[PDB]
Design an enzyme around this catalytic site. Structure first.
Site, PDB file in Angstrom:
ATOM      1  N   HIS A   1     -13.463  -6.072  27.350  1.00  0.00           N
ATOM      2  CA  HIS A   1     -12.420  -6.124  28.408  1.00  0.00           C
ATOM      3  C   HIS A   1     -12.846  -5.298  29.636  1.00  0.00           C
ATOM      4  O   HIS A   1     -12.319  -5.583  30.721  1.00  0.00           O
ATOM      5  CB  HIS A   1     -11.039  -5.785  27.864  1.00  0.00           C
ATOM      6  CG  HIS A   1     -10.771  -4.337  27.683  1.00  0.00           C
ATOM      7  ND1 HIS A   1     -10.853  -3.733  26.426  1.00  0.00           N
ATOM      8  CD2 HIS A   1     -10.314  -3.408  28.551  1.00  0.00           C
ATOM      9  CE1 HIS A   1     -10.482  -2.481  26.548  1.00  0.00           C
ATOM     10  NE2 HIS A   1     -10.154  -2.248  27.848  1.00  0.00           N
TER      11      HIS A   1
ATOM     12  N   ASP B   1     -14.154  -5.645  20.362  1.00  0.00           N
ATOM     13  CA  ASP B   1     -14.043  -5.362  21.823  1.00  0.00           C
ATOM     14  C   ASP B   1     -15.293  -4.633  22.308  1.00  0.00           C
ATOM     15  O   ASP B   1     -15.291  -3.426  22.434  1.00  0.00           O
ATOM     16  CB  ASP B   1     -12.794  -4.563  22.180  1.00  0.00           C
ATOM     17  CG  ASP B   1     -12.383  -4.723  23.643  1.00  0.00           C
ATOM     18  OD1 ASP B   1     -13.200  -5.291  24.470  1.00  0.00           O
ATOM     19  OD2 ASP B   1     -11.216  -4.408  23.928  1.00  0.00           O
TER      20      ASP B   1
ATOM     21  N   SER C   1     -11.356   3.228  27.833  1.00  0.00           N
ATOM     22  CA  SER C   1     -11.941   2.014  27.242  1.00  0.00           C
ATOM     23  C   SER C   1     -13.458   2.061  27.456  1.00  0.00           C
ATOM     24  O   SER C   1     -13.892   2.497  28.547  1.00  0.00           O
ATOM     25  CB  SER C   1     -11.304   0.788  27.772  1.00  0.00           C
ATOM     26  OG  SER C   1     -10.069   0.602  27.073  1.00  0.00           O
TER      27      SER C   1
END
Ligand SMILES: N[C@@H](Cc1ccccc1)C(=O)N[C@@H](Cc1ccc(O)cc1)C(=O)O
Ligand SMILES: N[C@@H](Cc1ccccc1)C(=O)N[C@@H](Cc1ccc(O)cc1)C(=O)O
Lengths: 697, 697
Positions: B62, B200, B633
């Site tokens: 992402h 991810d 992230s």
């Protein structure tokens, strides 16, 4: 443990029962009119149990919901407020059709039922009439003594038949319901879900006439004195503890053909869920404009919500366990196993081929049949059809009348007409008629071939539907007095009426009787093929060391196992919820809007002497690996010593597909803890008289 | 453990770090350009880390989504298909504005910062001009060497300022992305949720010129050769293991005033979530009608979904923990403790009162500014504003140009105009303009006081809006060559233009610069009070024994704790998911549509040597009690020995409200296991070249 064991299978589960922790002798469980099995009662669609010697009965809130709704108004809404009766004279009639069935006798009549069927030869309509006549004759002999009602049950596809005799109590009164925000905490959001925090319980009392025999409601009726009643557990229920349930599961389909499953999965379940969700929006909107509509339709809205969500859960479950794959593989293994049996296996193989043929019959009539079926079951139209049908049956000798329209059914038909007064609003009925007619007129012309409905619509668009609903609006069947007059009327009076609902019933009836005759022909063909093929599946299952027990069929079943949670990847469901979990879900908005006295008592940790030190709180709901289904709601959960530790009321999301393919890993019963029921009656919605009657205060 | 600890606080956590199970020395962590911390890089909005001597960078999918998005077409869709570059020359530019920041040094410049503010005096506007000038001046100097980027960070409300100096890598290339069905398995359904099964992760490569200084994309740039890179763990990560994270959390609001929290909870989060949900429906509807709309708006829709769902989670979290009550009780305890400090208390007590009157300025104009702000930030109009603004700023000298319109920002502006090419469809941008203008013309007359917009609308309904969107459609700014022409055009060419979007930019710009002055005034009045009140809270917190660490501000932070689940009533979330969990979530429908090769390998138990015996499967994601937020992230998760055991990518549902009020009970990080990363690159969407380079083959 897997299985909805018949009492006659107790010898086969006696060892497993002991191993799981039963401290009663399996022998004590085989006396079905003794302590404790004699305290378990049927309500007709739900289970309950006697919990006092003065005829107190405990069941779920959602089982008492109909009775609570019949006694509710927009101004005095007992569904929302709850109810308590401090004295016998404060108890409310649960309605004319409320029943408590107390088991008196089970008789095996398999050999006689099989002889009556065989006696008919190779004609399917004669086979269906033979079983009908046999059923009627058994039931008439068994009901000759006043106050008994009998029912013939078919087990294992018609391989076994038993006759149940019950004392039929006809005067059932509401004693206690908690508020709806307790009884139905979490509403349709938490329905079919764990974790669960629902106080799903209520109390009735059974009454009889002063002469001791069952009687409809009367001022001088007195409480029933049951021979046996359950006692609330004194031992605290904990994880891994033995539990068992006795109750009346309605219908399972574990023995269905792969094609019966495929039809249900690909058409029936998604289609009913779609239409029920749309009707529910319509009822919710009407309810917001008029609280009288909300109250009069509350029981219908509740059942329709439950079914639509159950169906969506079954469809997800089938994908979870690959139900389609599992049915296909089992059916392939049974047909291959028969083949290897040679001669002896040809009858079952031929029975299979015959049932397989029965499937295709509904393909481009299923949508029509659904819409016309639903339209004809709307309130005024359905009342007109039932009333006209009864007028026809009354001209025949009683033994020749259709099951449902005999002398033994008259008080139930009349009660239905009476209960409709609390469940009917013309403006809501018109919206339901419009909804199903709209779906009908949207079918392709090939399928819209209901000639009577085509005549009454005289069109296939919005104005045609509005016109027919406008016409049917002139009915007088909204009037209770009109319905009770029609209840006594002869066939000729129906045929002379200019009541448009009655005219519709007279017009559709010939095509209804022909559809019924076709059904009885299909039934008669199944009376020989179904048992042969189901016996082969059962034989195959026993060859594979699999558990063999009949599909549920509304008769008394025992299931057992232990208190335990279940798991998915990343998650372990713990076997108990607690008071803090109720307060953690509070939003102040329906359906997470607990009474203030509950939120206050949880914040203060007022555990009222009911804390389980192993949980650090009072338990609310619990999980166990028992095998229950629709009809088991209100079943008593008994511990190792046969004491009441809770009521069955629901299953977890993953359990619902076990109607078709049982999954032991994720199938759990959800029960309300007897300690939460006591806590609610102490701390939240007081019932001091009831806690005294239960010897809990 | 609670805390986004700055590296300087390493002394204080040194012991807890060791209690938690850190087998490396805390001294090793203070070495910020050393091992392991020197492997950790900033992407700007995401974290990442060097994992090879040839500049191989690992981050989340992402985080790479914008890069993948830019390299995607409706025909060749790398979001869906994934991507792999088997050789250096197959690697795709991640976009002109893609960066890798490698930390060079941190210097404290607090005293000189507090000097600059003081030496302006009173006039709020001078105070903010002063700080801007000190900021511009400190950066201009720090960046004098060709290939460095510097940033002034304000901490604890302006009690501490630090200059960060980074090597700015300007040539970042995509190396590997798994399918979107792996990278973003569960999509917006599983987002902010546990259990989680999302792989991810993605890989970039950092390039520099042959001289070894950073450069923009060029064919004969070579890979950067980092001083430090992380090794993938050989020790199998299990429950209770020590884990830590280093990275660049963006913004927390734990030190906000009770009134800033009340505004966000009562207006900002509900309003943004509502309007984002409606815009997402529109983009979904448009993308279904046009596959070119779908790919070009994938990154916007992904970000808006993430924000909308995050806010709904924050609002729900506030109710779970009673954030409103905790903020009021803290803001009341700080003031009481200051009023017992006598003379030492009074400067903070006055600083509070000064801040407490920046709140009542918005109630009337908040909806207008939201709707006009969003409209002004649609693509054609937003380009038109930015380009016209730059032409205004170009004519000034550098150090008096607005931050973001300086020489050192030109490359980023031009990069944005180029990126728009892969993110713009006229009919979608018109739908977006329509949505936001529609919200504007819905406002009461008194709030609809944007002079230029009222002029351009000439009306207050859907028709007036459609009239203006029609006008604005006449723009040529949809063309990239057009946008690059305007990028180098002077003020007067803009003011001469008949392009309606340029005409709108010019017309609104006066009101825009006015609003920006009233904003810098606003900033000015706060720049002395905020420091004083936030130090009082820190002191009060220090006094109560509560952890003290600054709110995230996009600078480097360390968090640490242990692999651990969490629970709520009736449920324990276990710390790992496994392959079988991915398979169990398969629907074949987006977003639960794993590659066939994943489902085949899971079925076949092809664990590729990556089994954890304790789980009986390959782990996928894990939970831990670290304290992370937006920006974290792609942060490497390091074990006891500073080896990479996974990447931070998300937080469970209950974690998101910890942006305002931390909750140690239910705040967890969700991370992708490094064995899932390897397993995907072996068994599912192969990257044999990567496995080699990482030394896993
Ligand atoms: N889902 C329950 C009814 C309910 C609705 C709303 C709130 C609370 C309860 C239900 O249908 N219960 C069944 C019993 C049952 C059915 C299937 C299953 O797997 C387990 C239990 C009933 O009413 O008899
Ligand atoms: N929710 C994630 C982004 C995402 C969306 C869909 C699928 C997978 C990931 C997100 O916002 N991650 C943050 C990191 C974060 C934020 C808050 C939190 O409590 C924990 C982690 C990011 O992008 O940096």
């Amino acid at each position: 443990a897997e299985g909805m064991w018949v009492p006659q299978q107790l010898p086969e589960i006696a060892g497993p029962l002991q191993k799981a922790g039963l401290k009663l002798s399996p022998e004590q469980l085989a006396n079905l009119t003794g302590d404790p099995m004699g305290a378990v009662v049927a309500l007709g669609g739900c289970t309950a149990s006697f919990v006092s010697p003065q005829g107190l009965v405990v069941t779920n809130h959602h089982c008492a919901y109909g009775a609570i709704q019949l006694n509710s108004t927009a101004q005095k809404n007992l569904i929302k407020d709850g109810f308590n009766a401090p004295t016998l004279k404060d108890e409310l009639s649960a309605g004319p059709n409320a029943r408590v069935f107390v088991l008196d006798q089970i008789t095996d009549v398999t050999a006689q039922a099989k002889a009556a069927i065989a006696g008919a030869g190779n004609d399917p309509l004669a086979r269906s009439r033979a079983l009908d006549a046999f059923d009627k004759a058994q039931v008439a002999a068994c009901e000759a003594d006043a106050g008994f009602r009998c029912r013939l049950y078919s087990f294992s596809g018609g391989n076994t038949y038993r006759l149940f005799r019950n004392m039929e109590i006809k005067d059932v009164r509401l004693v206690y319901a908690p508020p709806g925000s307790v009884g139905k905490f979490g509403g349709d959001v938490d329905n079919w879900m764990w974790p669960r925090h629902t106080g799903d319980f209520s109390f009735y009392r059974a009454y009889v006439g002063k002469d001791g025999k069952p009687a409809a409601f009367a001022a001088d009726n007195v409480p029933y004195q049951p021979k046996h009643f359950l006692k609330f557990a004194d031992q605290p229920l904990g994880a891994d503890d033995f539990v068992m349930v006795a109750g009346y599961p309605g219908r399972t389909n574990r023995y269905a053909l792969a094609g019966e499953f495929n039809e249900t999965a690909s058409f029936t379940y998604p289609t009913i869920a779609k239409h029920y969700n749309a009707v529910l929006k319509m009822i919710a909107d009407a309810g917001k404009a008029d609280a009288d509509v909300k109250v009069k339709y509350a029981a219908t809205a509740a059942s329709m919500n439950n079914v639509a969500k159950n169906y969506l859960g079954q469809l997800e479950g089938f994908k979870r366990i690959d139900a389609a794959g599992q049915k296909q593989a089992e059916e392939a293994a049974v047909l291959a196993w028969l083949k290897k049996q040679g001669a002896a296996g040809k009858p079952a193989l031929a029975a299979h081929a015959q049932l397989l043929k029965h499937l295709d019959t509904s393909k481009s009539t299923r949508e029509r049949d659904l819409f016309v079926g639903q339209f004809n079951n709307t309130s005024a139209v359905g009342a007109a059809i039932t009333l006209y049908r009864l007028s026809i049956e009354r001209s025949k000798p009683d033994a020749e009348r259709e099951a449902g329209y005999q002398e033994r059914d008259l008080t139930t038909i009349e009660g239905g007409l009476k209960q409709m007064d609390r469940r009917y609003v013309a403006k809501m009925d018109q919206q339901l008629q419009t909804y199903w007619l709209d779906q009908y007129v949207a079918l392709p012309a090939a399928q819209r071939d209901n000639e009577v409905l085509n005549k009454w619509l005289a069109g296939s668009d919005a104005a045609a539907v509005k016109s027919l609903v406008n016409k049917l609006g002139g009915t007088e069947l909204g009037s209770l007095d009109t319905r009770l007059k029609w209840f006594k009327a002869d066939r000729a009076a129906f045929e002379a009426s200019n009541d448009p609902a009655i005219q519709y019933a007279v017009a559709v009836m010939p095509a209804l009787l022909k559809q019924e005759e076709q059904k009885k022909i299909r039934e008669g063909e199944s009376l020989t093929a179904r048992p042969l093929y189901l016996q082969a599946v059962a034989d195959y299952k026993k060859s594979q060391g699999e558990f063999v027990y009949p599909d549920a069929n509304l008769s008394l079943r025992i299931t057992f196992g232990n208190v335990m949670g279940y798991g998915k990847d990343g998650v372990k469901y713990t076997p108990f919820t607690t008071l803090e979990g109720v307060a953690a879900k509070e939003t102040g908005e329906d359906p997470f809007d607990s009474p203030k006295a509950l939120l206050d008592a949880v914040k203060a940790k007022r555990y009222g002497g009911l804390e389980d030190k192993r949980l650090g709180s009072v338990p609310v709901n619990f999980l166990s690996n028992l095998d229950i289904t629709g009809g088991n709601s209100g079943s008593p959960v008994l511990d190792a010593n046969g004491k009441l530790v809770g009521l069955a009321f629901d299953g977890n999301w993953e359990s619902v597909s076990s109607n078709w393919v049982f999954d032991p890993v994720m199938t759990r019963m959800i029960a309300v803890d007897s300690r939460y029921m006591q806590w609610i009656m102490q701390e939240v919605a007081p019932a001091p008289q009831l806690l005294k009657e239960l010897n809990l205060a």
